[PDB]
Paper text:
Succinyl-CoA reductase ([name]) is an acylating aldehyde reductase that catalyzes the NADPH-dependent reduction of succinyl-CoA to succinic semialdehyde (SSA). In Clostridium kluyverii and other Clostridia species, succinyl-CoA reductase operates in fatty acid fermentation, allowing for the co-assimilation of ethanol and succinate. In these fermentations, succinate is first activated to succinyl-CoA, which is then reduced to SSA by [name] before being further converted into 4-hydroxybutyrate. The reaction mechanism of [name] supposedly follows the canonical reaction mechanism of acylating aldehyde dehydrogenases. In these enzymes, the respective acyl-CoA enters the active site, where the acyl moiety is transferred onto an active site cysteine, leading to a covalent acyl-cysteine intermediate.
We addressed this promiscuity by solving the crystal structure of a [name] of [name] in complex with NADP+ and mesaconyl-C1-CoA. Our structures at a resolution between 2.1 and 2.2 Å (re-)confirm catalytically active residues and residues necessary for the coordination and binding of mesaconyl-C1-CoA. Each monomer has an extended C-terminal loop that reaches into the second subunit within the complex. The freed CoA moiety is protonated by a nearby histidine before exiting the active site, while the acyl moiety is reduced to the aldehyde by NADPH.
Author numbering:
A (entry chain B), B (entry chain A): 5 to 453
Write the structure that this text describes.
C-alpha cells in the first residue's frame, strides 16, 4: 500500500496498456463513463451523505451529463500513434502517452472527477492513481471500484486505475513527485503543491463567477438561468454564479425578476449583515454552510426566509474588498451590485476577480454582441458563458465548451492552461519533420521588408 | 534593484502594454529580432569571448537565422483580443497575456534565447525579466540593452524587458516564484527549479540526438548533414547530432563517407579511450572541452588529428550504459555504432535515450517512409528530423518545426510541452461560449449507442 508500490503497479499496467490500439482504449473509456451514468443514483446519494453537501437530484444530473458529454466528445478523437498528416508543412504528428497520471480529486465532485480524469488518461494509453479528498474517499473509492469491475470484464490490464486511501501529505507529495504528470482538482493549496512537485502539472483555481445582466435583456430568462446555476448542488460548483451585476436604471426590475423566480432579496443593511456574519468568519467562508440549503443558512443567520426560496440575494456594500460577500460563496447566496455603464459593470467584475477567482468563469446575459465581445476581450477569465447558466462552463449539449470536471484557470489561477482539461493534455504530440527541398533562401528584403 | 522591485516595474509595464493593439506589438517584436540580425557580428564575437565556447561564424549564422525565422513565423499570427470565430461550435476565441514572464537563459545561446523569449512574450502583450547564466551575463545584458533602445525609439513603455544583474540563489528562485509564467532554457537543474516554483513553467530538457543512417541511403549526403549539425557552434546545440547508428553491412562505406567529408574516425580501442578519458571525468562531461575545437580535444587527448578535421568519430563499445560516449557530448565528437536490422537500430537509439536525453530530438537519414514512421512512433522524442541536419529541429526555412530557442522535451524530459516554444505558450486563450438552441436533449441510445 506504499506509493512506490502503486507507482510500480501503474508503470507495469501502463506498458501493457501502451500496446492497445485506438479502438481498444475507446472500448474501455466508453465503459468507464457508462458505469457512472448507469449508477448515477447510488453514487449521488452516497456523495451527498458522505460529504454532507450538495443536492441528490443535482448530483444525479451531474453524473448523467458529465459521463455522456465527455464520451460523446472524445469518442472520435485520435490519440494513438500517428494522428495527423500535414503535407503543407511536411509534418506528421504522433500521439504518445505521458505515462502515469497522479490525480487529486475534490470533495465537491468526488464521483465525476475520478471518472473524467480516468477517461482522459486511458484514452491516451496513460494509467492513473487517484488520491481523493479525505471527506469523500469512500464514494471516490467506490467509483474506482465499479470502474475497475467493468475494466476486468473487458480484459483490461490490471491496475490501470488505482486509488490511495490514506491522504498522508507525505504520501500525496511523494505521489505527485513520482508520477509523470499531475492533475490537481481542488483548493488553492493542492494546486500549488502540484506546481511545486517538479513534474508537469494541470491544476484548477477557485471560482468566483461574476455575472453581468445587460440593459434591455429579458430579465426573466436571465434570473431563471442565474438561479439555476447558483442553486445547483447547493452552489458548490466552481463555475457557479456568485454575483448579479445589474443596471441601476432597471435595478428594481431585475430584482423583481429574481423574486418572481424564487429568490429572496435582502436590501436592509442590518439584515444583510446577519447573513454576512454567518457566511464568513474572519474573512473566510464558514465551512458549516458550504453546500447547505437556503433554510440552513437562514436559520443560522436568524432571518426568516419564505418556504420555497431557491437563492438568497444580498445587496452588497460595494465591489471588491468593500464587501466580503464579493468573495466566492459555495452556497446558494448571491451578492447584488449596481452599474451605470457596461464599462462600470466590467470594472466591478474585475475588482471581484482580483479579490478572488481570477482566471475562471464569467456569465453574461445580453443581446448586445459588442458588449459580450468587450467583456470577453478584457475580463480575466478563461470562459465567458452567454445567456445560459454559468454551470454549463464545464460542458453542455448546447454550447461548445469541452466537457470536463477540471476547469483550468490560466496564469491568473496559477495554472498551465486557460481551458477545460481533456484527453489532449495527457498525451505527448511528436512531430516527424520532413525536408522540403523546393524552397529557396529568402533574402534580407523578403524577411525584414 | 531587488527582484520584488523588478516584478513591480514589470507589472506596471505590462498594464501599459496590455492596451497595445496587434499592429503595435508587431512593430516592437519585429524590431527586437532585427536588432539582433543587424548586430549579429558584434554579438557573436562577444559571446565567443565571454562564454569561451562556440564558433564565431556559427553564432553569426545563428543570430541571422533565428531572428529572421522567428519574425517570419509570427509576423501574421493573431495574438491580441478576439483571434478566431468558430460558429460551428458557437465559440469565439480571445487571446490574453499571461503577465510577467521569468526567463532563465543559457550559456550556449546567450543572445538568441533572450531575443526569442522577449519576442514571444511581447507578441502576446507580456513583459519579461531575463535571468542570464553567470558565464554569459555581459553579452546577454548587452542584447537586452540594445533591444530596449529599439523599444524606446518606437515609443514603447519602459521596462517591458528587464534583466537580473545578479546570478542565482534566492534571487532567481524568488523571480520564478513571483512571476506569472516561467521559461527555463538550460540544464536539468534550471528545469527542475522551474517546475518546483509553484508557477506555470516551460522547460527544455538535456538533448542527446540519436541518428540512424538507413540502409541504401545516400551516405555522402547523410554524412554531410550529420557533420554539419554535429560541428555547429562546436557542438553546443541541444539538438546536435550525437551518434551515428550505421548498418553493419555497409559500415565501412558510411565511415568512408564521413572521412570523405572531414571526419577523423577512430577504431582502435586504446586510442578511443584517450578521447573518452578526456571527454568524460567520473561519468560527467569535462567542462574544459565543452564547445571547444577538435584540435583542443585532440591535444588534451594526446592524439594527432589532421588539420582541417571537422568532427571526431569514435567507435563505441556498445549501446546505452556500455559506453559513457553514448551520453550527450557538447563538443564536435560522435559515437559510432552498428546494427543488423532497422528494428535493432531503433532499439540502440532507444537505449541511448534511456541513458540521457529522452524526449528531445532524433535524426534519421532514409528513403523508406515505413522505417521513418516506425522510428518516429517508437522513439521517446518530441521531434524526428529527416534527411537534414538535426540542428534544424529548432526551425529552418526548409522544414515545418516552429522556430525557437526553447525546445521542450515533453513529459520524458519533465517538461510541460513536447514541442518548440512559441508566442502561443505565453498567451491565455479564452472562449466565449454562446447558447445553441437548435440542439435537442439526446436520448440514452443517442448517448451510449
Ligand atoms: N476549477 C475546477 O474545475 C474546480 C473543481 C472543483 C473545485 N474547484 C475549486 O476548489 C475549491 C474546492 O476544493 P474542495 O471543495 O476540494 O475543498 P478545498 O477548497 O480543497 O479545501 C479543502 C480543505 O482541506 C484541505 N485539504 C484539501 N485536500 C486535502 C487532502 N488531500 N488531504 C488533506 N487536507 C486536504 C485544504 O487545505 P490545502 O489548502 O492544503 O488544500 C483545505 O483546508 C473551490 O474553491 C472550488 O471552486 C475547482
Ligand atoms: N532544449 C533546449 O532548447 C536547450 C537549450 C539550451 C540548452 N539546453 C540543454 O542545456 C544543457 C546546457 O545548459 P547550459 O549550457 O546553459 O549549462 P547548464 O547545464 O544550464 O548549467 C551548467 C552548470 O552551471 C550551474 N549554474 C550555476 N549558476 C547557474 C545559474 N544562475 N543558471 C544556470 N546554471 C547555473 C548549473 O547548476 P544547476 O544544476 O543548478 O543548473 C550547472 O551545474 C545542455 O544539456 C543542452 O542540451 C537545451
Amino acid at each position: 500500500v506504499s506509493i512506490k508500490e502503486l507507482i510500480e503497479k501503474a508503470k507495469v499496467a501502463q506498458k501493457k496498456l501502451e500496446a492497445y490500439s485506438q479502438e481498444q482504449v475507446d472500448v474501455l473509456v466508453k465503459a468507464l463513463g457508462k458505469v457512472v451514468y448507469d449508477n448515477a443514483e447510488m453514487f449521488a446519494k452516497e456523495a451527498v451523505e458522505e460529504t454532507e453537501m450538495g443536492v441528490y437530484e443535482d448530483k444525479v444530473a451531474k453524473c448523467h451529463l458529465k459521463s455522456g458529454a465527455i464520451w460523446n466528445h472524445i469518442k472520435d478523437k485520435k490519440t494513438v500513434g500517428i494522428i495527423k498528416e500535414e503535407p503543407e508543412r511536411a509534418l506528421v504528428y504522433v500521439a504518445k502517452p505521458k505515462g502515469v497520471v497522479a490525480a487529486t480529486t475534490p470533495i465537491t465532485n468526488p464521483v465525476v472527477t475520478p471518472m473524467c480524469n480516468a477517461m482522459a488518461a486511458i484514452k491516451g494509453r496513460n494509467t492513473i492513481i487517484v488520491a481523493p479528498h479525505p471527506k469523500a474517499k469512500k464514494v471516490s473509492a467506490h467509483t474506482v471500484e465499479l470502474m475497475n469491475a467493468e475494466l476486468k470484464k473487458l480484459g483490461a490490464p490490471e491496475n490501470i486505475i488505482q486509488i490511495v486511501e490514506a491522504p498522508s501529505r507525505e504520501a500525496a507529495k511523494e505521489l505527485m513527485e513520482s508520477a509523470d504528470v499531475v492533475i490537481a482538482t481542488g483548493g488553492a493549496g493542492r494546486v500549488k503543491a502540484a506546481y511545486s512537485s517538479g513534474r508537469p502539472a494541470y491544476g484548477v483555481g477557485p471560482g468566483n463567477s461574476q455575472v453581468i445582466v445587460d440593459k434591455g435583456y429579458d430579465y426573466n430568462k436571465a434570473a431563471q438561468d442565474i438561479i439555476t446555476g447558483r442553486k445547483y448542488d447547493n452552489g458548490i460548483i466552481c463555475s457557479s454564479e456568485q454575483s448579479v451585476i445589474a443596471p441601476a436604471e432597471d435595478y428594481d426590475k431585475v430584482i423583481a425578476a429574481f423574486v418572481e423566480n424564487g429568490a429572496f432579496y435582502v436590501e436592509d443593511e442590518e439584515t444583510v449583515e446577519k447573513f454576512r456574519s454567518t457566511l464568513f468568519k474572519d474573512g473566510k467562508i464558514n465551512s458549516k454552510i458550504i453546500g447547505k440549503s437556503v433554510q440552513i443558512i437562514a436559520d443560522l443567520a436568524g432571518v426568516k426566509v419564505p418556504e420555497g426560496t431557491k437563492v438568497i440575494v444580498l445587496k452588497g456594500k460595494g465591489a471588491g474588498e468593500k464587501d466580503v460577500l464579493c468573495k466566492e460563496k459555495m452556497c446558494p447566496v448571491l451578492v447584488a451590485l449596481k452599474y451605470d455603464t457596461f464599462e462600470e459593470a466590467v470594472e466591478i467584475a474585475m475588482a471581484n476577480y482580483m479579490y478572488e477567482g481570477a482566471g475562471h468563469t464569467a456569465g453574461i446575459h445580453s443581446d448586445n454582441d459588442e458588449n459580450i465581445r468587450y467583456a470577453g476581450t478584457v475580463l480575466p477569465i478563461s470562459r465567458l458563458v452567454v445567456n445560459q447558466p454559468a454551470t454549463t462552463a464545464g460542458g453542455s449539449f448546447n454550447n461548445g465548451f469541452n466537457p470536463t470536471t477540471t476547469l483550468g484557470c490560466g496564469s491568473w489561477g496559477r495554472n498551465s492552461i486557460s481551458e477545460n482539461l481533456t484527453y489532449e493534455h495527457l498525451i505527448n504530440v511528436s512531430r516527424i519533420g520532413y525536408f522540403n527541398k523546393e524552397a529557396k533562401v529568402p533574402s534580407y528584403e523578403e524577411i525584414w521588408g
